[PDB]
Design a protein around this ligand. Structure first.
Ligand SMILES: *[C@@H]1O[C@H](CO)[C@@H](O)[C@H](O)[C@H]1NC(C)=O
Ligand SMILES: *[C@@H]1O[C@H](CO)[C@@H](O)[C@H](O)[C@H]1NC(C)=O
Ligand SMILES: [Zn+2]
Ligand SMILES: [Zn+2]
Ligand SMILES: [Zn+2]
Ligand SMILES: [Zn+2]
Lengths: 218, 517, 211, 523, 181, 193
């Protein structure tokens, strides 16, 4: 019943501003303190901001203080986070969270979390991935390198789902140029290299790019 | 430390605002109670005070059409909306059986529902395990408060808990749980429960380690000073009990029907002892606005109510004759139909065949000229008092005297005239009062073939009364103080509607059960 | 800000093994501590909201304890659903800092990595860049070290590493180390070796393509 | 173009062959009706004559054990086997409700089911639209015939259709349907419906464009000549109605219970007008052999009835004293139970509005043979009820005068003390006998439940007043004496089977507890 | 015998349009005409059994009309489940002759045939063309060849053909002449 | 409910005879005229025979008159078609169809059709397929196989075509190993191309 829905997140140029919104349902919004919580890719939770039921007590993390502004509309059951003077350090999934305490005087942690909205503060333009083959030399490893794309989400499959065993798709790494790099590998029997065709399919929805690379022994 | 106990008890599904007498709200500018108004007051208190603990002492199930339609779903929904901190099982929580408690309330409540003296058995033990706890340690502010709950031993007789539940003594079941809380470093303990004011005082005196007692089941009003409404206090608020250990234990009740919100401030020391306590029940009149969101939710849920109320329960061939000039002077169709509903509901005490009912309980007739349609609204108009039909054990002399009282003041159009079922009574108004019951035959029980045999004064009989008759209403004082056994039963309108829906076409007649010389 | 420390950073545990996580505050926070459990790709779930109060629906095997500066989370009889990341959070006053986190991962026997090397594809060589990949397949524990020895010269920079989560079945890890060079820079050297040191190996494993 | 309309109406679940009065078959050489026999007759007519249109006017539901066990599945199955061409909804089709109508019959039937004056509202309109049609255009031979259905407006009072169904006026709803049919170039129109003979005549007179009217709901017998059985015709077959347009419209009906097969032959010209119409219902007596395949199917379906015979219908708290020493000497709770069963069955679902207020029941004491023991966990089974009522009769509705009823009650105690079975168990009647008086004056008190009164109460009998009472078919056809009844009936209607009625009442009354309430007393 | 002609031999229609099929007998048969619908690999099902008489369980979408010598089947607001072969059958007297049939096909855009050669019996393969009316020649040869055309594809709704006999296959089709060896 | 089961169809030489049988289950068999219908592979419907309920009225198509013989046993609820002096033009799927009309004097089409029985008339003997290899496209040619049913897997599978020698031919193509299963000859060939 208790539900929080984030919105407004997206791609931000460095130094620009963006307003996150959070719609609340299933509970009295004006009875609970509401929090904004970060999670950057691969790192743990970071408390961003917090607001009381009547906006009388507002707190910010020392890393967002003076830039972010938390606010709330109890009439529309909405929470707002105006992020200003953004930088690459704010690239994270932001959760709006509802405090467990129904008392304005105490905090009992956060018991209801939203799905999160991703904010990607980067000057790199949306670019389609370049897919390269990692050719194999008992079993041989063979893969595809999904290099120099943006933003982060890409989907890598093998033989349209026919290969699901041995599929190791590594998390993307943000390169020094602001573009993401990725690689997916499969370990397969060496006798299957000469007859079985291995194909890496890369899907980048943000750039609407579908690439199909046939990896061979070479 | 300072704790604010907000508590309610015996609400009886009074979700909407009611009148001063807790009936249907006619004048909305002079109406009390409601879950929206209670939400407003509780919200104010919680915003104003740091340590608040909203507790429920039970009997939140049953009392109005809300429970008839939603059967406890509305109760759990609106206590989750009001964010109760704990609840204690009342007897009425078992009215729909243990299955009617597990599904709508136990599995849907977001707060601990407690009872330390209910023990499950056999197949029910695994199904109900973990749904209700003996106690709960709730963190309030920076402290922890241990709330241990209890239920009446009379629940098997006042309700339908089943054969797999045992309701043992409250003292000997609360003491082990209070000690267990003591070994868990909890020194502030609240005994929340549903056993009546007298058992609350007994728990306060006997159980060692209980600091505050919050109870229900008694509709007891405690007030310090001049009460704000028609309720007459039974004692000061809180009632201070000097326990055997030497401590002063406050005991608090908040009347019933959601009209009041008990408000008790207790100041503790570092060791958990009550230094003192003070407060009052807040009267929730029109001066407290109803919360617009909770009111809108009530309006949304009150559509299904008005949809169910209008629907047809059955067809009637005849005029049901609920007119005051008939039900209070002679045998009427409606009294016979009501007695038949009671008897059929009981039989379907498994051989009970007797029924008496005060004619003041029949208020409105039902018209068959409207295509012969009976609705829930018509039956609710007939019996708008929201009572239940209870089984009692009487003597022949007691029933005979009750029938004398039924016609001891005939001609005044009072409601003490009795409609009967499975009883053939012949009066004679010419003779003096106290002997006007010339003939009185009853259906024989424990016999192969039932027949109407003369009433034996020395014998013992089982009769289905209303609560009004079993509690000295419309006179009938000799009934209330002479019942050998008294067990509450199902609702009045519910029983009549079940009988009417079972018998798709009803045709009650004046069968000659009541006769005059 | 009340800085918050959590120990250990990661703990190895099997099913039925008792797990202890310690959270230490900078200053006394009385008993205002929350413990959260986060699965990969899912929002955090509140397990403990006071220092010892269990959230509704949380198994009784999770227990909280401690007060003041030191707090403890105990998982007795660990279950497969409890292999997640655990966070402590002080709820004293704003800012409401979180702890570092503690990953509880499935313990298993040691597994030597399978080392593969992938020379740069001719496509990216035509595109002006060279990417040399070194893959460590199905190793345990996570503590593995990778070095790049090009012409028997160690490269501290120009390398990045990616590590998968534990395998669904094998519960092992995989690592991919990428060495990125300019096409002209890659045209000079020949060796381009990847050396792997792991506790499951008696000696380091070196893989090269010598081209 | 000559059309042969075959029709049946008010079958009332008489699947197996019955006696001459719809009672259970005893002498196979003298039994009538039946689905198998009707199958043989319809097959002969179809093989021998070109344009044949078999229709049902309704009330195939309710009446026997078949409807209690199969809940209308047997009706749909055997009317598909007989290959009916169309069927009109009746009042009894709404027994067990719209839910009990849609699934067993409306879904399984292959023939169209027609009712123009039934409108669905609310949530039901989505679930029932298309299952029943206002009309059907059936090609018969090289020509095309439209059939418009209708049902009596009294269905809400004679059954339990619910609230989501509105039964509009027959004429005002049939007129747009007939106009639409004549728009579709259909010049041969048949009004197949279940609103009674009088309403059939009204439809023939008022509705323009209707050529033939096939009706039901009244069990009206029409015959031209010497009748073949005990049914006395109320008119000629077909009954010719002079329409307001000057045309002559046949109106036909084939009594009830599948005893007759209404058989009509109509001559149509090129314009669709009726030149001539003649025929007579066919008595399906023993001369017509039962079809072996349909009989085998009936025997196959009887297995579930035999299994259900041992099923527990309900429970009884008290001992059902059906012994001869009790039910033939005094008031016995078994007789009260049976009278309550008859009255409740009649009031829940009534054949006609004429009988919808009947609260009086008489039942001879010789009709109760064995008691029912409550020591067997209180269970009552169909076998026990068969032991109580083994003759397999029916519960008929009969209109008498006060004098006839009082003379029947006098006869019931004319020879008291000889264990004779004429002692009447009563329901909705308070009778007090003075055995010391001479026969013919022993009934010293006789109060009956008023029906015209707003609130029913026991008022003294009036000898010139007219009372409706439910009897066994044994009593209505004479029986244990009681010749005064048979001689002085004013109206008679056959009803449901005895054990069927009692079992249905016990099923509704999941726990029964009849008592000796003083309906019969002695001074 | 009452020979019956059905027109057109093939109709290409889009989902939602109206399809009209005409059937004409050699003599008047009153309204003794039936319309059947048959799917590939399935037994035919009766849609209309007398002129303008819908079969039970058949949508009112199909409508029959006509009398005497001329009859018509109309499928208004076509749906994907109505792409089948429809036959008219006279039920006047024995013999009960059927019609030639009328195939209802999905209408899609014109697609050029993808031509491939296969030397040995040389095979000429046409892929994903539309409409079905293509023509293939060998120019080796007249005769001594067999053409197999698949039914309309479930997804692409196209047609494929295979003709079996320099031996250069020449293909002419309205979506284009492609000659390949 | 209603159901018609056909049997007796199969391989037969030209000039020989067959006897197709049709069992009726869920309707009154002796009330409906019963028809034998014929559908050549890839061709349209062709009503070949019909019999009345009492066998009084019997009709044959002009192409089967003088050779075929329809009959019925009402006691066994069965329909028979004796087929004498068969030819290569009589190979087709035979449907046992039930007339919709319940009137013996009219025909209302045919509402119930049983699953057809395949009657193949050919002098060729059953033998295994011969498999040959064949944007780019590849495929396999399955030539000289008999009888008609065969399965090809690896995708366009063309209909089979009869040669002048009575042996079926087939081709399957794909866009870039052909597996051919012929149950009557119990053959399974996996040929790579
Ligand atoms: C409501 O109760 C309060 C408290 O006793 C009282 O002051 C007030 O007058 C009452 N009524 C109204 C209408 O405000
Ligand atoms: C059957 O009834 C017919 C009239 O329909 C009559 O002629 C015939 O004699 C009857 N037969 C018997 C055995 O009753
Ligand atoms: Zn109460
Ligand atoms: Zn109570
Ligand atoms: Zn009727
Ligand atoms: Zn009727």
């Amino acid at each position: 019943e208790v539900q929080l829905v984030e919105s407004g997140g997206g791609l931000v140029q460095p130094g620009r501003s963006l307003r996150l919104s959070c719609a609340a349902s299933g509970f009295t919004f004006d009875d609970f303190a509401m929090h904004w919580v970060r999670q950057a890719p691969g790192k743990g939770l970071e408390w961003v901001s917090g607001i009381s039921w009547n906006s009388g007590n507002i707190g910010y993390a020392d890393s967002v203080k003076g830039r972010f502004t938390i606010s709330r509309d109890n009439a529309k059951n909405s929470l707002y986070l105006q992020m200003n003077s953004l930088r690459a350090e704010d690239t994270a999934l932001y959760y709006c969270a509802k405090d467990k305490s129904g008392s304005p005087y105490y905090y009992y942690g956060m018991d209801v979390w939203g799905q999160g909205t991703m904010v990607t503060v980067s000057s790199a333009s949306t670019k389609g991935p370049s897919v390269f083959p990692l050719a194999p030399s008992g079993t041989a490893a063979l893969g595809c390198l999904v290099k120099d794309y943006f933003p982060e989400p890409v989907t890598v499959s093998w033989n349209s789902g026919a290969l699901t065993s041995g599929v190791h798709t590594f998390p993307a790494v943000l390169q020094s140029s602001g573009l993401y790099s990725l690689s997916s590998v499969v370990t397969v029997p060496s006798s299957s290299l000469g007859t079985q065709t291995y194909i890496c399919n890369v899907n980048h929805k943000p750039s609407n790019t579908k690439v199909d690379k046939r990896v061979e022994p070479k | 430390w300072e704790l604010t106990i907000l508590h309610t008890n015996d609400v009886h599904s009074r979700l909407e605002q009611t009148s001063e007498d807790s009936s249907k709200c006619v004048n909305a500018s002079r109406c009390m109670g409601g879950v929206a108004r209670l939400f407003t007051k509780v919200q104010q208190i919680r915003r104003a005070e740091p340590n608040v603990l909203l507790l429920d002492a039970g009997d939140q199930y049953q009392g109005t059409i809300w429970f008839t339609v939603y059967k406890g779903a509305e109760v759990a929904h609106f206590m989750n909306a009001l964010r109760y901190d704990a609840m204690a099982l009342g007897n009425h929580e078992f009215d729909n059986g243990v299955e009617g408690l597990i599904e709508p309330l136990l599995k849907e409540a977001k707060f601990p529902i407690l009872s330390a003296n209910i023990k499950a058995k056999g197949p029910l033990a695994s199904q109900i395990s973990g749904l209700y706890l003996p106690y709960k340690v709730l963190p309030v502010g920076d402290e922890v408060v241990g709330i241990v709950g209890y239920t009446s031993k009379e629940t098997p007789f006042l309700s339908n808990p089943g054969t797999n539940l045992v309701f043992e003594d409250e003292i000997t079941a609360l003491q082990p749980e209070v000690d267990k809380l003591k070994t868990l470093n909890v020194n502030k303990i609240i005994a929340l429960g549903h056993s009546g004011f007298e058992m609350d005082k007994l728990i306060a005196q006997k159980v060692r380690g209980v600091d505050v007692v919050v109870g229900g089941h008694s509709n007891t009003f405690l007030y310090t000073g001049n009460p704000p409404s028609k309720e007459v206090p039974a004692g000061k608020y809180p009632f201070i009990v000097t326990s055997d250990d030497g401590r002063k234990v406050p005991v608090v009740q908040a009347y019933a029907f959601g009209k009041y919100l008990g408000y008790l401030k207790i100041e503790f020391d570092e060791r958990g002892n009550v230094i003192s306590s003070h407060g009052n029940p807040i009267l929730l009149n029109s001066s407290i606005p109803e919360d617009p969101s909770i009111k809108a939710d009530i309006n949304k849920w009150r559509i299904k109510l008005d949809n169910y109320s209008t629907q047809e329960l059955g067809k009637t061939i005849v005029y049901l004759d609920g007119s005051s000039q008939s039900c209070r002077f002679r045998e009427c169709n409606m009294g016979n139909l009501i007695c038949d509903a009671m008897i059929n509901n009981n039989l379907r005490w498994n051989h009970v065949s007797m029924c008496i009912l005060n004619g003041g309980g029949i208020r409105s007739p039902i018209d068959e000229r409207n295509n012969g349609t009976i609705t829930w609204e018509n039956l609710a108009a007939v019996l708008p008092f929201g009572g239940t039909f209870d089984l009692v054990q009487l003597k022949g002399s007691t029933l005979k005297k009750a029938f004398e009282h039924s016609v001891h003041r005939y001609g005044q159009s009072t409601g003490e005239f009795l409609q009967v079922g499975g009883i053939h009574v012949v009066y004679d108004l010419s003779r003096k009062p106290g002997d006007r019951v010339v003939k009185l035959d009853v259906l024989c029980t424990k016999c192969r073939v039932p027949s109407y045999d003369p009433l034996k004064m020395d014998e013992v009989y089982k009769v289905i009364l209303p609560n009004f008759l079993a509690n000295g209403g419309d006179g009938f004082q000799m009934i209330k103080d002479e019942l050998l056994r008294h067990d509450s039963g199902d609702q009045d309108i519910n029983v009549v509607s079940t009988y009417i829906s079972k018998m798709k076409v009803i045709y009650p007649a004046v069968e000659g059960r009541i006769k005059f010389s | 800000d009340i800085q918050m420390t959590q120990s250990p950073s990661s703990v190895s545990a099997s099913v039925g093994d008792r797990v202890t996580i310690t959270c230490r505050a900078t200053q006394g926070i009385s008993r205002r501590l929350a413990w959260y459990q986060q699965k990969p790709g899912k929002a955090p779930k509140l397990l403990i909201y006071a220092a010892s109060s269990l959230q509704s629906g949380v198994p009784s095997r999770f227990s909280g304890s401690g007060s003041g500066t030191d707090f403890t989370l105990t998982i007795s009889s660990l279950q497969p659903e409890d292999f997640a990341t655990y966070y402590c959070q002080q709820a004293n006053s704003f800012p409401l800092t979180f702890g570092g986190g503690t990953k509880v991962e499935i313990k298993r026997t040691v597994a030597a990595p399978s080392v593969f090397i992938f020379p740069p594809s001719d496509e990216q060589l035509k595109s002006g860049t060279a990417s040399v990949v070194c893959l460590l397949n199905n190793f345990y524990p996570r503590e593995a070290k990778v070095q790049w020895k090009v012409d028997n010269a160690l490269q501290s920079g120009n390398s990045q590493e990616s590590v998968t989560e534990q395998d669904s079945k094998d519960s092992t890890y995989s690592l991919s180390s990428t060495l990125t060079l300019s096409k002209a820079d890659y045209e000079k050297h020949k060796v381009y070796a990847c050396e792997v040191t792991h506790q499951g190996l008696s000696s380091p494993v070196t893989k090269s393509f010598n081209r």
